[PDB]
Amino acid sequence: EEDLALKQQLELYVERVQDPDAGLQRVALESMRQEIRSATSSMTSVPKPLKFLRPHYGTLKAFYETMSDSDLKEFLADILSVLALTMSAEGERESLKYRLLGSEGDIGS
């Protein structure tokens, strides 16, 4: 039940990111960043959040393409740069392109 609840939370966060409200978008993106940081600390297995968020990579890419410049854009660029680790085809430099457009936040996080 816990895995299903986490998957439901992830898809709900994606839907809230798709919502036009800037505040809700910021809240969802911050929650996604927090959970990604928490899960990545597990060195013993591929994070489940990545496995659950794999299908939404194209939708998030389109949403990035549809947004105007803003801090939300930088946070979403950081998220997509982190996500490209598992979905970028060999030779597709999406991660670096989104990182150069991302924030100058601490890489180690």
Short mmCIF file of all heavy atoms in Angstrom, two decimals, unseen atoms left out:
data_model
loop_
_atom_site.label_atom_id
_atom_site.label_comp_id
_atom_site.label_asym_id
_atom_site.label_seq_id
_atom_site.Cartn_x
_atom_site.Cartn_y
_atom_site.Cartn_z
N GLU A 1 0.83 -1.20 0.00
CA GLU A 1 0.00 0.00 0.00
C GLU A 1 0.86 1.26 0.00
O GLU A 1 0.49 2.28 -0.58
CB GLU A 1 -0.93 0.01 1.21
N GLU A 2 2.02 1.18 0.66
CA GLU A 2 2.91 2.33 0.73
C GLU A 2 3.42 2.73 -0.65
O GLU A 2 3.46 3.92 -0.99
CB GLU A 2 4.08 2.03 1.66
N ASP A 3 3.81 1.75 -1.47
CA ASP A 3 4.28 2.05 -2.82
C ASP A 3 3.18 2.68 -3.66
O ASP A 3 3.43 3.64 -4.41
CB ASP A 3 4.81 0.79 -3.49
N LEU A 4 1.96 2.15 -3.57
CA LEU A 4 0.84 2.74 -4.31
C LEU A 4 0.57 4.16 -3.84
O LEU A 4 0.29 5.05 -4.66
CB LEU A 4 -0.41 1.87 -4.14
N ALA A 5 0.64 4.41 -2.53
CA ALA A 5 0.44 5.76 -2.02
C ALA A 5 1.52 6.70 -2.54
O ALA A 5 1.22 7.85 -2.91
CB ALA A 5 0.44 5.74 -0.49
N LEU A 6 2.77 6.25 -2.57
CA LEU A 6 3.84 7.09 -3.10
C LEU A 6 3.64 7.39 -4.58
O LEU A 6 3.86 8.52 -5.03
CB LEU A 6 5.20 6.42 -2.87
N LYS A 7 3.22 6.39 -5.36
CA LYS A 7 2.96 6.61 -6.78
C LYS A 7 1.82 7.60 -6.98
O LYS A 7 1.88 8.48 -7.85
CB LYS A 7 2.65 5.28 -7.47
N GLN A 8 0.76 7.47 -6.18
CA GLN A 8 -0.35 8.41 -6.26
C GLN A 8 0.11 9.82 -5.89
O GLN A 8 -0.29 10.80 -6.54
CB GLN A 8 -1.48 7.96 -5.34
N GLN A 9 0.94 9.94 -4.86
CA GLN A 9 1.48 11.25 -4.50
C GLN A 9 2.30 11.84 -5.63
O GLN A 9 2.22 13.04 -5.91
CB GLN A 9 2.32 11.13 -3.23
N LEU A 10 3.11 11.01 -6.30
CA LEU A 10 3.94 11.50 -7.39
C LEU A 10 3.09 11.99 -8.56
O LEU A 10 3.34 13.07 -9.11
CB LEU A 10 4.90 10.41 -7.86
N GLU A 11 2.08 11.21 -8.96
CA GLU A 11 1.24 11.65 -10.07
C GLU A 11 0.43 12.89 -9.69
O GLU A 11 0.21 13.78 -10.52
CB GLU A 11 0.32 10.52 -10.55
N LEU A 12 -0.02 12.97 -8.43
CA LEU A 12 -0.71 14.17 -7.98
C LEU A 12 0.21 15.39 -7.99
O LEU A 12 -0.22 16.49 -8.34
CB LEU A 12 -1.27 13.94 -6.57
N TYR A 13 1.48 15.21 -7.60
CA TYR A 13 2.44 16.31 -7.68
C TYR A 13 2.65 16.75 -9.12
O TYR A 13 2.75 17.95 -9.40
CB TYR A 13 3.77 15.89 -7.05
N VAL A 14 2.74 15.79 -10.04
CA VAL A 14 2.87 16.15 -11.45
C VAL A 14 1.66 16.95 -11.92
O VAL A 14 1.79 17.97 -12.60
CB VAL A 14 3.08 14.89 -12.31
N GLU A 15 0.46 16.50 -11.54
CA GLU A 15 -0.75 17.21 -11.93
C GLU A 15 -0.76 18.63 -11.36
O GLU A 15 -1.13 19.58 -12.06
CB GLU A 15 -1.99 16.44 -11.48
N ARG A 16 -0.37 18.78 -10.10
CA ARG A 16 -0.28 20.11 -9.50
C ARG A 16 0.76 20.98 -10.20
O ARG A 16 0.55 22.19 -10.34
CB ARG A 16 0.05 20.01 -8.02
N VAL A 17 1.87 20.39 -10.64
CA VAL A 17 2.82 21.13 -11.46
C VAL A 17 2.16 21.61 -12.74
O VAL A 17 2.41 22.72 -13.20
CB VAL A 17 4.07 20.27 -11.75
N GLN A 18 1.29 20.78 -13.33
CA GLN A 18 0.56 21.19 -14.52
C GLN A 18 -0.50 22.25 -14.23
O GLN A 18 -0.99 22.87 -15.18
CB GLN A 18 -0.11 19.98 -15.17
N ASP A 19 -0.85 22.48 -12.97
CA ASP A 19 -1.85 23.49 -12.65
C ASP A 19 -1.28 24.89 -12.92
O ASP A 19 -0.08 25.12 -12.75
CB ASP A 19 -2.29 23.39 -11.20
N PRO A 20 -2.12 25.84 -13.33
CA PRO A 20 -1.61 27.18 -13.66
C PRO A 20 -1.20 28.01 -12.45
O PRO A 20 -0.50 29.01 -12.63
CB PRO A 20 -2.80 27.83 -14.38
N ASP A 21 -1.60 27.63 -11.24
CA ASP A 21 -1.32 28.41 -10.04
C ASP A 21 0.18 28.36 -9.76
O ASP A 21 0.75 27.29 -9.57
CB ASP A 21 -2.12 27.88 -8.85
N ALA A 22 0.81 29.54 -9.73
CA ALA A 22 2.25 29.60 -9.47
C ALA A 22 2.59 29.09 -8.08
O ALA A 22 3.59 28.39 -7.90
CB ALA A 22 2.75 31.03 -9.64
N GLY A 23 1.77 29.43 -7.07
CA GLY A 23 2.05 28.96 -5.73
C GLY A 23 1.97 27.45 -5.60
O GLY A 23 2.85 26.82 -5.00
N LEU A 24 0.92 26.85 -6.17
CA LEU A 24 0.81 25.39 -6.13
C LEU A 24 1.93 24.74 -6.92
O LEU A 24 2.45 23.69 -6.52
CB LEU A 24 -0.56 24.96 -6.67
N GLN A 25 2.32 25.34 -8.05
CA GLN A 25 3.45 24.81 -8.81
C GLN A 25 4.72 24.83 -7.98
O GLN A 25 5.48 23.85 -7.97
CB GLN A 25 3.63 25.62 -10.10
N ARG A 26 4.97 25.93 -7.28
CA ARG A 26 6.16 26.02 -6.43
C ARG A 26 6.11 24.98 -5.32
O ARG A 26 7.12 24.32 -5.03
CB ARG A 26 6.29 27.42 -5.84
N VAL A 27 4.95 24.82 -4.69
CA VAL A 27 4.83 23.84 -3.61
C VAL A 27 5.10 22.44 -4.13
O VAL A 27 5.84 21.66 -3.51
CB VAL A 27 3.44 23.95 -2.95
N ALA A 28 4.49 22.08 -5.26
CA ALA A 28 4.69 20.75 -5.82
C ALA A 28 6.14 20.52 -6.22
O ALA A 28 6.69 19.45 -5.97
CB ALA A 28 3.76 20.55 -7.02
N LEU A 29 6.77 21.52 -6.84
CA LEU A 29 8.16 21.37 -7.25
C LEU A 29 9.08 21.22 -6.04
O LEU A 29 10.02 20.42 -6.05
CB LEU A 29 8.59 22.55 -8.11
N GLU A 30 8.82 22.00 -4.98
CA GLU A 30 9.63 21.88 -3.77
C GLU A 30 9.46 20.51 -3.12
O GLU A 30 10.43 19.90 -2.67
CB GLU A 30 9.26 22.99 -2.78
N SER A 31 8.22 20.01 -3.06
CA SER A 31 7.99 18.68 -2.51
C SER A 31 8.69 17.62 -3.35
O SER A 31 9.29 16.68 -2.81
CB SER A 31 6.50 18.40 -2.43
N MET A 32 8.63 17.75 -4.68
CA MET A 32 9.30 16.80 -5.55
C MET A 32 10.81 16.83 -5.33
O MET A 32 11.46 15.77 -5.26
CB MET A 32 8.97 17.10 -7.01
N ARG A 33 11.39 18.02 -5.21
CA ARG A 33 12.82 18.13 -4.96
C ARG A 33 13.19 17.50 -3.62
O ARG A 33 14.19 16.78 -3.52
CB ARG A 33 13.24 19.60 -4.99
N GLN A 34 12.39 17.76 -2.58
CA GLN A 34 12.67 17.19 -1.27
C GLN A 34 12.63 15.67 -1.31
O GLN A 34 13.53 15.00 -0.78
CB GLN A 34 11.67 17.73 -0.25
N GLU A 35 11.60 15.10 -1.93
CA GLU A 35 11.49 13.64 -1.97
C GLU A 35 12.58 13.02 -2.83
O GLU A 35 13.09 11.95 -2.51
CB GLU A 35 10.10 13.22 -2.46
N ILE A 36 12.95 13.69 -3.93
CA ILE A 36 14.04 13.18 -4.76
C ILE A 36 15.35 13.18 -3.97
O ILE A 36 16.12 12.22 -4.02
CB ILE A 36 14.17 14.01 -6.05
N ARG A 37 15.61 14.26 -3.23
CA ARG A 37 16.82 14.32 -2.42
C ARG A 37 16.81 13.22 -1.36
O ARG A 37 17.84 12.57 -1.12
CB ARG A 37 16.94 15.69 -1.76
N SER A 38 15.66 13.01 -0.71
CA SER A 38 15.58 11.97 0.31
C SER A 38 15.81 10.58 -0.28
O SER A 38 16.52 9.76 0.30
CB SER A 38 14.23 12.04 1.02
N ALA A 39 15.20 10.30 -1.44
CA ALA A 39 15.31 8.97 -2.03
C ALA A 39 16.71 8.72 -2.57
O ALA A 39 17.24 7.60 -2.44
CB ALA A 39 14.27 8.81 -3.14
N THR A 40 17.33 9.73 -3.19
CA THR A 40 18.66 9.55 -3.75
C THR A 40 19.69 9.18 -2.69
O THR A 40 20.74 8.63 -3.03
CB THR A 40 19.10 10.82 -4.48
N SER A 41 19.42 9.48 -1.42
CA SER A 41 20.34 9.10 -0.35
C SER A 41 20.46 7.59 -0.20
O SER A 41 21.40 7.11 0.44
CB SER A 41 19.89 9.72 0.97
N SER A 42 19.53 6.83 -0.78
CA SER A 42 19.56 5.37 -0.72
C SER A 42 20.48 4.86 -1.82
O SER A 42 20.15 4.88 -3.01
CB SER A 42 18.15 4.79 -0.84
N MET A 43 21.66 4.40 -1.41
CA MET A 43 22.68 3.93 -2.35
C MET A 43 22.46 2.47 -2.71
O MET A 43 23.11 1.94 -3.61
CB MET A 43 24.07 4.13 -1.74
N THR A 44 21.53 1.80 -2.02
CA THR A 44 21.35 0.37 -2.16
C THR A 44 20.40 -0.04 -3.28
O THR A 44 20.30 -1.24 -3.57
CB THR A 44 20.83 -0.24 -0.84
N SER A 45 19.70 0.90 -3.92
CA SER A 45 18.77 0.54 -4.98
C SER A 45 18.44 1.78 -5.79
O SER A 45 18.61 2.91 -5.31
CB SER A 45 17.49 -0.07 -4.40
N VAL A 46 17.97 1.57 -7.02
CA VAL A 46 17.51 2.67 -7.87
C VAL A 46 16.27 3.26 -7.21
O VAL A 46 15.33 2.53 -6.90
CB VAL A 46 17.21 2.18 -9.30
N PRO A 47 16.22 4.58 -6.97
CA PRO A 47 15.06 5.16 -6.29
C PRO A 47 13.74 4.81 -6.96
O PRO A 47 13.59 4.96 -8.17
CB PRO A 47 15.33 6.66 -6.34
N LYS A 48 12.77 4.35 -6.16
CA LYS A 48 11.43 4.12 -6.68
C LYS A 48 10.80 5.37 -7.27
O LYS A 48 10.08 5.25 -8.29
CB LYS A 48 10.54 3.56 -5.56
N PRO A 49 10.97 6.57 -6.71
CA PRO A 49 10.38 7.76 -7.34
C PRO A 49 10.79 7.94 -8.79
O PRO A 49 9.97 8.36 -9.61
CB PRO A 49 10.89 8.91 -6.46
N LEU A 50 12.04 7.62 -9.13
CA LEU A 50 12.45 7.70 -10.53
C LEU A 50 11.67 6.71 -11.39
O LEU A 50 11.23 7.04 -12.49
CB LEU A 50 13.96 7.44 -10.65
N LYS A 51 11.49 5.48 -10.89
CA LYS A 51 10.75 4.48 -11.64
C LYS A 51 9.31 4.92 -11.85
O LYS A 51 8.74 4.69 -12.93
CB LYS A 51 10.79 3.14 -10.91
N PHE A 52 8.69 5.53 -10.84
CA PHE A 52 7.32 6.00 -10.98
C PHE A 52 7.20 7.25 -11.84
O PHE A 52 6.16 7.44 -12.48
CB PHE A 52 6.72 6.27 -9.59
N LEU A 53 8.23 8.09 -11.87
CA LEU A 53 8.18 9.34 -12.62
C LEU A 53 8.70 9.19 -14.05
O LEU A 53 8.59 10.14 -14.83
CB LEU A 53 9.00 10.41 -11.89
N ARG A 54 9.24 8.03 -14.40
CA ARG A 54 9.70 7.82 -15.78
C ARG A 54 8.64 8.13 -16.83
O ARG A 54 8.98 8.76 -17.84
CB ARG A 54 10.22 6.38 -15.95
N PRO A 55 7.36 7.74 -16.67
CA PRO A 55 6.42 7.94 -17.78
C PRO A 55 6.11 9.41 -18.04
O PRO A 55 5.69 9.75 -19.15
CB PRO A 55 5.16 7.18 -17.33
N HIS A 56 6.31 10.28 -17.06
CA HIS A 56 5.96 11.69 -17.18
C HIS A 56 7.09 12.55 -17.72
O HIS A 56 6.96 13.78 -17.71
CB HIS A 56 5.51 12.24 -15.82
N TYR A 57 8.20 11.95 -18.16
CA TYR A 57 9.32 12.75 -18.63
C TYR A 57 8.95 13.58 -19.85
O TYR A 57 9.29 14.76 -19.94
CB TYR A 57 10.51 11.85 -18.94
N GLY A 58 8.23 12.98 -20.80
CA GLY A 58 7.82 13.72 -21.98
C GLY A 58 6.84 14.84 -21.66
O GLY A 58 6.94 15.94 -22.20
N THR A 59 5.89 14.56 -20.77
CA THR A 59 4.94 15.59 -20.36
C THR A 59 5.67 16.75 -19.68
O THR A 59 5.36 17.92 -19.93
CB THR A 59 3.89 15.00 -19.42
N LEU A 60 6.64 16.44 -18.82
CA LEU A 60 7.39 17.50 -18.15
C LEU A 60 8.25 18.28 -19.14
O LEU A 60 8.41 19.50 -19.00
CB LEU A 60 8.26 16.90 -17.04
N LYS A 61 8.80 17.60 -20.15
CA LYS A 61 9.56 18.29 -21.18
C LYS A 61 8.67 19.27 -21.95
O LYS A 61 9.05 20.42 -22.20
CB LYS A 61 10.18 17.27 -22.13
N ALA A 62 7.46 18.82 -22.32
CA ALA A 62 6.53 19.71 -23.00
C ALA A 62 6.14 20.89 -22.11
O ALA A 62 6.08 22.03 -22.57
CB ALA A 62 5.28 18.93 -23.43
N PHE A 63 5.89 20.62 -20.82
CA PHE A 63 5.53 21.70 -19.90
C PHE A 63 6.66 22.71 -19.78
O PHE A 63 6.42 23.92 -19.74
CB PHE A 63 5.17 21.12 -18.54
N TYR A 64 7.91 22.22 -19.73
CA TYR A 64 9.06 23.12 -19.75
C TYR A 64 9.06 23.96 -21.01
O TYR A 64 9.30 25.18 -20.96
CB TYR A 64 10.35 22.31 -19.65
N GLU A 65 8.80 23.34 -22.16
CA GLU A 65 8.74 24.07 -23.41
C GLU A 65 7.63 25.12 -23.42
O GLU A 65 7.74 26.11 -24.15
CB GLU A 65 8.54 23.11 -24.58
N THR A 66 6.57 24.92 -22.64
CA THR A 66 5.42 25.81 -22.66
C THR A 66 5.49 26.94 -21.64
O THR A 66 4.60 27.80 -21.63
CB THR A 66 4.13 25.02 -22.43
N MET A 67 6.50 26.96 -20.78
CA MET A 67 6.58 27.96 -19.71
C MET A 67 7.50 29.11 -20.10
O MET A 67 8.51 28.91 -20.79
CB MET A 67 7.08 27.32 -18.41
N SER A 68 7.15 30.31 -19.64
CA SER A 68 8.01 31.47 -19.79
C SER A 68 9.06 31.50 -18.69
O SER A 68 8.95 30.78 -17.69
CB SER A 68 7.18 32.76 -19.76
N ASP A 69 10.08 32.33 -18.88
CA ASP A 69 11.20 32.40 -17.95
C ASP A 69 10.73 32.78 -16.54
O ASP A 69 9.95 33.72 -16.37
CB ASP A 69 12.24 33.40 -18.44
N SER A 70 11.22 32.05 -15.54
CA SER A 70 10.89 32.33 -14.15
C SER A 70 11.72 31.41 -13.26
O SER A 70 12.41 30.51 -13.74
CB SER A 70 9.39 32.14 -13.87
N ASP A 71 11.63 31.65 -11.95
CA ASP A 71 12.31 30.81 -10.97
C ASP A 71 11.75 29.40 -11.03
O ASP A 71 12.49 28.41 -10.89
CB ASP A 71 12.17 31.39 -9.57
N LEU A 72 10.43 29.29 -11.21
CA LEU A 72 9.83 27.98 -11.43
C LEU A 72 10.48 27.27 -12.60
O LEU A 72 10.69 26.05 -12.55
CB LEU A 72 8.33 28.13 -11.69
N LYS A 73 10.83 28.00 -13.66
CA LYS A 73 11.51 27.39 -14.79
C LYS A 73 12.87 26.84 -14.37
O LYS A 73 13.27 25.76 -14.81
CB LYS A 73 11.67 28.39 -15.93
N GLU A 74 13.61 27.58 -13.54
CA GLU A 74 14.91 27.10 -13.09
C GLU A 74 14.77 25.83 -12.24
O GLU A 74 15.54 24.87 -12.41
CB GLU A 74 15.63 28.19 -12.30
N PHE A 75 13.80 25.82 -11.33
CA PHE A 75 13.60 24.63 -10.50
C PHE A 75 13.20 23.43 -11.35
O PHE A 75 13.70 22.31 -11.16
CB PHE A 75 12.55 24.90 -9.43
N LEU A 76 12.29 23.64 -12.31
CA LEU A 76 11.89 22.55 -13.19
C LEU A 76 13.05 22.10 -14.08
O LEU A 76 13.16 20.92 -14.39
CB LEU A 76 10.70 23.00 -14.04
N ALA A 77 13.92 23.03 -14.48
CA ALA A 77 15.10 22.65 -15.24
C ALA A 77 16.03 21.78 -14.41
O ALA A 77 16.59 20.80 -14.92
CB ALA A 77 15.84 23.90 -15.73
N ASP A 78 16.20 22.11 -13.13
CA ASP A 78 16.98 21.25 -12.25
C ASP A 78 16.36 19.86 -12.14
O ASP A 78 17.06 18.85 -12.20
CB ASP A 78 17.11 21.89 -10.87
N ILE A 79 15.03 19.81 -11.99
CA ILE A 79 14.36 18.52 -11.87
C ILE A 79 14.54 17.70 -13.14
O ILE A 79 14.83 16.49 -13.09
CB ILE A 79 12.87 18.73 -11.54
N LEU A 80 14.39 18.32 -14.31
CA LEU A 80 14.55 17.60 -15.57
C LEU A 80 16.00 17.19 -15.80
O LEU A 80 16.26 16.13 -16.38
CB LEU A 80 14.04 18.45 -16.74
N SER A 81 16.96 18.01 -15.35
CA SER A 81 18.35 17.61 -15.44
C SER A 81 18.61 16.37 -14.59
O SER A 81 19.34 15.46 -15.00
CB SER A 81 19.26 18.76 -14.99
N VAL A 82 18.02 16.32 -13.39
CA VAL A 82 18.15 15.13 -12.56
C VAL A 82 17.47 13.93 -13.22
O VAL A 82 17.97 12.80 -13.14
CB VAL A 82 17.58 15.39 -11.15
N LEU A 83 16.33 14.16 -13.87
CA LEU A 83 15.57 13.06 -14.47
C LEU A 83 16.23 12.51 -15.73
O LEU A 83 16.08 11.32 -16.02
CB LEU A 83 14.15 13.54 -14.80
N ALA A 84 16.95 13.35 -16.47
CA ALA A 84 17.56 12.89 -17.71
C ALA A 84 18.60 11.81 -17.47
O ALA A 84 19.01 11.11 -18.40
CB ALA A 84 18.20 14.08 -18.45
N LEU A 85 19.04 11.65 -16.21
CA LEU A 85 20.00 10.60 -15.89
C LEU A 85 19.50 9.23 -16.31
O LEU A 85 20.30 8.35 -16.65
CB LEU A 85 20.28 10.61 -14.39
N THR A 86 18.18 9.02 -16.30
CA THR A 86 17.59 7.71 -16.54
C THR A 86 16.80 7.62 -17.84
O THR A 86 16.49 6.51 -18.28
CB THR A 86 16.66 7.33 -15.38
N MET A 87 16.47 8.75 -18.48
CA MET A 87 15.66 8.74 -19.69
C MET A 87 16.36 9.30 -20.91
O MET A 87 15.84 9.13 -22.02
CB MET A 87 14.36 9.53 -19.47
N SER A 88 17.51 9.96 -20.76
CA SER A 88 18.19 10.53 -21.91
C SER A 88 18.87 9.44 -22.73
O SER A 88 19.66 8.65 -22.20
CB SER A 88 19.22 11.56 -21.46
N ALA A 89 18.55 9.39 -24.02
CA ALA A 89 19.18 8.41 -24.90
C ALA A 89 20.65 8.74 -25.09
O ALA A 89 21.05 9.91 -25.09
CB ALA A 89 18.46 8.38 -26.25
N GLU A 90 21.47 7.70 -25.25
CA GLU A 90 22.90 7.88 -25.45
C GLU A 90 23.17 8.86 -26.58
O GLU A 90 22.77 8.62 -27.73
CB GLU A 90 23.57 6.53 -25.75
N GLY A 91 23.84 9.96 -26.27
CA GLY A 91 24.13 11.01 -27.23
C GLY A 91 23.24 12.22 -27.12
O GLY A 91 23.58 13.27 -27.70
N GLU A 92 22.12 12.13 -26.41
CA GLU A 92 21.21 13.26 -26.22
C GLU A 92 21.65 14.01 -24.98
O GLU A 92 21.48 13.55 -23.85
CB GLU A 92 19.77 12.78 -26.11
N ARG A 93 22.24 15.19 -25.19
CA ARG A 93 22.75 15.99 -24.08
C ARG A 93 21.66 16.87 -23.48
O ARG A 93 21.78 18.10 -23.45
CB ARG A 93 23.93 16.85 -24.55
N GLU A 94 20.58 16.24 -23.01
CA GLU A 94 19.51 16.99 -22.35
C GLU A 94 19.91 17.45 -20.96
O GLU A 94 19.57 18.58 -20.56
CB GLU A 94 18.25 16.13 -22.27
N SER A 95 20.63 16.62 -20.21
CA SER A 95 20.95 16.95 -18.83
C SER A 95 21.77 18.23 -18.74
O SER A 95 21.44 19.13 -17.97
CB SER A 95 21.70 15.78 -18.18
N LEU A 96 22.84 18.33 -19.54
CA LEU A 96 23.67 19.52 -19.49
C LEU A 96 22.93 20.75 -20.01
O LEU A 96 23.10 21.85 -19.48
CB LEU A 96 24.96 19.31 -20.29
N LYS A 97 22.11 20.58 -21.05
CA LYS A 97 21.36 21.71 -21.57
C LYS A 97 20.40 22.26 -20.53
O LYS A 97 20.25 23.48 -20.39
CB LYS A 97 20.60 21.30 -22.83
N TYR A 98 19.74 21.38 -19.77
CA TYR A 98 18.83 21.85 -18.73
C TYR A 98 19.59 22.37 -17.51
O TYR A 98 19.09 23.25 -16.81
CB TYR A 98 17.87 20.73 -18.32
N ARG A 99 20.79 21.84 -17.25
CA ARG A 99 21.58 22.31 -16.12
C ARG A 99 22.12 23.71 -16.36
O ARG A 99 22.08 24.56 -15.46
CB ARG A 99 22.72 21.34 -15.84
N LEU A 100 22.63 23.98 -17.56
CA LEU A 100 23.09 25.32 -17.89
C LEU A 100 21.97 26.34 -17.80
O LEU A 100 22.23 27.52 -17.55
CB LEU A 100 23.70 25.34 -19.30
N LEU A 101 20.72 25.91 -18.00
CA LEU A 101 19.56 26.77 -17.83
C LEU A 101 18.97 26.69 -16.43
O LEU A 101 17.98 27.37 -16.15
CB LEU A 101 18.48 26.39 -18.86
N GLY A 102 19.56 25.87 -15.55
CA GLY A 102 19.08 25.72 -14.20
C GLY A 102 19.72 26.71 -13.23
O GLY A 102 20.45 27.62 -13.61
N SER A 103 19.43 26.50 -11.95
CA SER A 103 19.94 27.36 -10.90
C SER A 103 21.39 27.01 -10.57
O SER A 103 21.88 25.93 -10.94
CB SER A 103 19.08 27.24 -9.64
N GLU A 104 22.07 27.92 -9.88
CA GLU A 104 23.45 27.71 -9.46
C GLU A 104 23.50 27.06 -8.09
O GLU A 104 24.49 27.20 -7.36
CB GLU A 104 24.22 29.03 -9.46
N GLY A 105 22.43 26.35 -7.71
CA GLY A 105 22.38 25.73 -6.40
C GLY A 105 23.44 24.66 -6.23
O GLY A 105 24.07 24.20 -7.19
N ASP A 106 23.65 24.27 -4.97
CA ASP A 106 24.67 23.28 -4.64
C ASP A 106 24.45 21.99 -5.42
O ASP A 106 23.38 21.39 -5.36
CB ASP A 106 24.65 23.00 -3.13
N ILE A 107 25.48 21.56 -6.15
CA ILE A 107 25.39 20.33 -6.93
C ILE A 107 25.32 19.11 -6.01
O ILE A 107 24.63 18.13 -6.31
CB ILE A 107 26.57 20.22 -7.91
N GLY A 108 26.04 19.15 -4.88
CA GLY A 108 26.14 18.00 -4.01
C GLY A 108 24.81 17.53 -3.45
O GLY A 108 24.71 16.37 -3.02
N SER A 109 23.80 18.39 -3.44
CA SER A 109 22.51 18.03 -2.87
C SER A 109 21.78 16.95 -3.67
O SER A 109 20.79 16.41 -3.17
CB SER A 109 21.63 19.27 -2.75
#
